[PDB]
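Ticket reopened. Same input as before:
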Amino acid sequence: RCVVNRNGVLETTINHFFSRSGLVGVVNLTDGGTDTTGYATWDIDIMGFVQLRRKCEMFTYMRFNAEFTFVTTTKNGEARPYMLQYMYVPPGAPKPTGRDAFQWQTATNPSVFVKLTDPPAQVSVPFMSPASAYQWFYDGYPNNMMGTFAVRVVSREASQLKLQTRVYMKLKHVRAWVPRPIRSQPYLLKNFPNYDSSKITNSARDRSSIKQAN
Amino acid sequence: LETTINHFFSRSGLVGVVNLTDGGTDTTGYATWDIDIMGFVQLRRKCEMFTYMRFNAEFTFVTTTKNGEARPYMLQYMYVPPGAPKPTGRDAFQWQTATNPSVFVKLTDPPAQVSVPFMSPASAYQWFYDGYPNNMMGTFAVRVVSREASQLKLQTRVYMKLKHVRAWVPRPIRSQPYLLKNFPNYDSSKITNSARDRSSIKQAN
Amino acid sequence: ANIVLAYGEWPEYCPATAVDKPTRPDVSVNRFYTLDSKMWQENSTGWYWKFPDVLNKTGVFGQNAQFHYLYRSGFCLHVQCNASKFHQGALLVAVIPEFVIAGRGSNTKPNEAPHPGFTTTFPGTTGATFHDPYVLDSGVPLSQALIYPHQWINLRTNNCATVIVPYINAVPFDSAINHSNFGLIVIPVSPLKYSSGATTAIPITITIAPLNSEFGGLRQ
Amino acid sequence: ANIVLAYGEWPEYCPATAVDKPTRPDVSVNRFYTLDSKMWQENSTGWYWKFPDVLNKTGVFGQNAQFHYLYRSGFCLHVQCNASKFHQGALLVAVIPEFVIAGRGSNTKPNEAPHPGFTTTFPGTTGATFHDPYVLDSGVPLSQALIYPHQWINLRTNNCATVIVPYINAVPFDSAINHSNFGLIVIPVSPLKYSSGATTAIPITITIAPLNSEFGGLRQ
Amino acid sequence: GIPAELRPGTNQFLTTDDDTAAPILPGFTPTPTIHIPGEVHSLLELCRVETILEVNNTTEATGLTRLLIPVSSQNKADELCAAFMVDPGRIGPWQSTLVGQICRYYTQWSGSLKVTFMFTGSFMATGKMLVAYSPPGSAQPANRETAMLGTHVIWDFGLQSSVSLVIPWISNTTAGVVTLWYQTNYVVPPETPGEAYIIAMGAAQDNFTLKICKDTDEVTQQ
Amino acid sequence: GIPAELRPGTNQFLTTDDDTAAPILPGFTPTPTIHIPGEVHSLLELCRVETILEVNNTTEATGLTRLLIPVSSQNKADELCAAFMVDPGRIGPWQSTLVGQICRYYTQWSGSLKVTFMFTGSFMATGKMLVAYSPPGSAQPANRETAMLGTHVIWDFGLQSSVSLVIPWISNTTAGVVTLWYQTNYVVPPETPGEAYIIAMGAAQDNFTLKICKDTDEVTQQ
Amino acid sequence: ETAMLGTHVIWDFGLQSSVSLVIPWISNTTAGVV
Amino acid sequence: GIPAELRPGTNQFLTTDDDTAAPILPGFTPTPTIHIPGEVHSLLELCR
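Engineering reply: fixed in the latest deploy. New output:
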């Protein structure tokens, strides 16, 4: 066709640019026998996947609330009605060390008790930074930002299933400051913007001549 | 009230049938379904009555098994907007893409229900395009959320309802049968008469 | 004379968000482009024309419609059919928005089924004749083709018809080469009859006035 | 002269809940600290400076910034590049908040990958040259580095640039030793050219004015 | 935390329910509408359009010539030119018209009709015709003087060229017969064909209303 | 105890639903905000910034010299300095710019553009250049007198040092070609290099608007 | 179709019986073809 | 009989939820309070 009309001005705001329920982490649970693993923790970092990391390294400062949705499946896929405990560990509180340790019975670690046959779990985490905004680019010399996230199967004895949880993160109420360019070189590490000195990828694919329209 | 265009189109009707298998060696896993309201020949005859149309859609997803029993497995429905690439595998990266809105619902749950707005770059849809220039509404995929592979074959029914429909430039109702899906090709030989025959012109048969 | 206004609206200008203002000739394009006469006979079937590629080879309108990119105009059609007082018959003249010519065949495979050529979809300034006028060459019966703006040319009442048709499209601007907007159809519902010694063929003359034309995006 | 104001805000004082009022010198720190000239040549790559540790060894500002604990100030940068009328080339001068120098290597293991040293992250009063100016030594292309406050120093139009930059940080007070706030980058996008017999190198001079300085927590 | 109860009808998916759904794209604004001429609001605007009836639907007829009533001069006089019913939703001449195709989607209809005739013939040829409506309950009339006692218009070719016959009232629950008789004769001067045609058209009125929607059966495939 | 029913859509987790959730920490107040300069509100503020295009994206080129258009004096006259497209969301010179990287997240864009040229050369060297926009539908012009009939600016080096060419309208649905021709010649006095460069930059306008968000494909890994 | 682009009148025999074509301007100093 | 839908978060037991519960004893009035000196309202009074 030929789009002569003007488009919409609501899909370009920062709040719309970030607010959408996206997949952010995948946690594997085993709940074994001899090898007493039992639990499976997952530190909160939005830089996990390379799809939101490229969108959040576009800005220097950000400020947002988060909504976490927990979708737990089994190995084959069937959902038997077992009780599950999700636990949010605030920044500074110690991580749980065992399946039946005393960090699970601690009252100041907010837990969610939900079954496999239930709708998936959904919690909201507020702005929990000591500064006024988050910042991924810290130029200088000085651990943890948002909190740890554990999960176990509530039972007296030990179950014989292995689970597989998906932590879907949605952002809300996001504000940004000091935009910066979009990174073209591929990633090498998780917490560092290291590129490769050899094999610098050009940000524009090649053509034959400068006097053409390829 | 039953003769308005809005009442003439708004009703929850069956529009598509999707077969899922979730096999072993033959890793099919998923099953996509492009959105086209011209699928069945019952709404195609009602929408080729008008030249321009404008409507929102409600999609209801009723998934059964082969025998009929509903075991509590998690299901992912995924809407692919026009321009976004279709998923190529059961565990590809088009499923984890955040801008493809998904619905997580079980077999034992009530059937799924979503609403899709007017997503055309023009001011109205048009099936009759006289001229020379792919996709209009979006693709629709579905898979079974699981780490390993399940051993069931599903069968989903996509029931479409229209809402907020508006029409422009009416045109006559097609009497010849259909031959293709995207083209109004009739048959030159064996032209069916639009009025069944009688004996004489001077009777009341 | 009776003037049928297509859908009760007059062709008017565009009230678009383009800073490049679309040009308006008003002088050399608002003239009566007269097509050649069609020789209607006893065994005739009908004729159809695709308008934004009927006048793409003719004069100032064709030059300013081929070398531009955006196009919007209405039309004033005027069809004479001058016959004697001893001839008899009837014509049906009607405009059809988005008149898609179908293909005639009995094949259901996608790239095996027949499709109309370029000289069948876009006839040009000489028009094209129907193969099956009972289904309008589209699988749609002509008995209910009176839903369109139309007139009857009955050879015992009058000899002329006129249709003022506005711009019917979903987008207010469109390419005048890659998209035919609407078609004109004349069909001899009642055939032509005459006694021996009369003129064996009746001419049909069509004149077109491009009311309220707008062009945009001038290029080479 | 054209003055570019960084993000449209002027450096102003803090309106914090500390009873110990932060001191304001206003006399011996609001003077033009002039750095040494950089010798720009044909095969040059660029230069970058980290500001709150550029002036930590120089005079009253360095003494009052090393022996304090809390720091907040804006800056007035002024860069001359005086060349003849027969030289040609172009410079891009731009400030970048939180300019993190990346490490160059092809290792994905955590404590095996290379990291920049102390003389690369914090150059001091003598600056440091880029290794790959196409990616700003950060994996980010310089073609879209115009999103920052910036000027062009074109050797056929002018010879000077000036940038008034306020305090950009999430916390209104910060240590002036353990955290470099923002960096200055000059890059020869267009190289230097000159006929034989001219001066083979062009000097670049930078002067800094610490506007609206505030210090807190005096200690030994 | 309000107390609540779930009544029968819970978790069912009713077809014709008027219930909202959560949108897939939030904040997505569509393309703004423009003024496209020719907007339809109800189907009564598609029923009121005149439409050629296929009254010559008998056999040994080609494609187009099924739309024409033949008239000739070697037809004696006081004869029967043609006859047809006045029942839209039924197999017959009212199947090719638009009101018949529209009234097949709905199972009840009511109101008045209008059948308009038009004579396609020479200018110099005159003659009278007797168009006659016979209301439901009566069979087809056998003579012309029996037809002139029912509803009738004596329509001549000289003055009028297109007569119109209003059908007072037809319901859905024999349905009434429109006959067309040869009042005088088809007189014709020399050097002029004594063979012409009549196009019959038909439409609904402002009284025409429909109720109880349903799918059609013109489509055979699925 | 009010009666209620559960309709379809119950217990489903829609991705793009705008639904509240129970907070983990109640009564927790976060750190109060301060005035951090440089707040962005929409992405149209990131599209309106001038950005160096990579017009020299051909091969045998180093890292930085891909951003420069070469100009010399041994180039005869009325020749073709350079040519490039005006389509942000596509592989080409508009891939290194910021409006091209932003318009790849969204699948539709509309509005006008602005391409600003800047001559990096000596002060004593003058000469004219013919910058020429050719709207969509046309191929690249072959001669300079064919280009001077389209959209054109005759930009000299003496008076002006940075010309700007406004692109009237581009849609997403060949896309139009910006050519740069050698109007007169690159004249140069002695003791001055006869080799200079042109930096090309490009940005959007207030007319530029985007619709239908989607993920990008610059990232290969997952 | 080349002639219908210049100056033209489509004159029918039924309605009109005598058409008139105005010649805009001719000088004395090929001269134009009807 | 109002229509309703159940969203995610249904049937979960959040720890720090501020949600009411049905009382075991209805109409039970407790013992009325008296003025006991030395009431604390916040922990900042114990830090000073």
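Chain E touches chain F through 20 residues (CB under 8 Å). The helical segments of chain E are 44-47, 98-102, 144-147. Please confirm and we'll close it.
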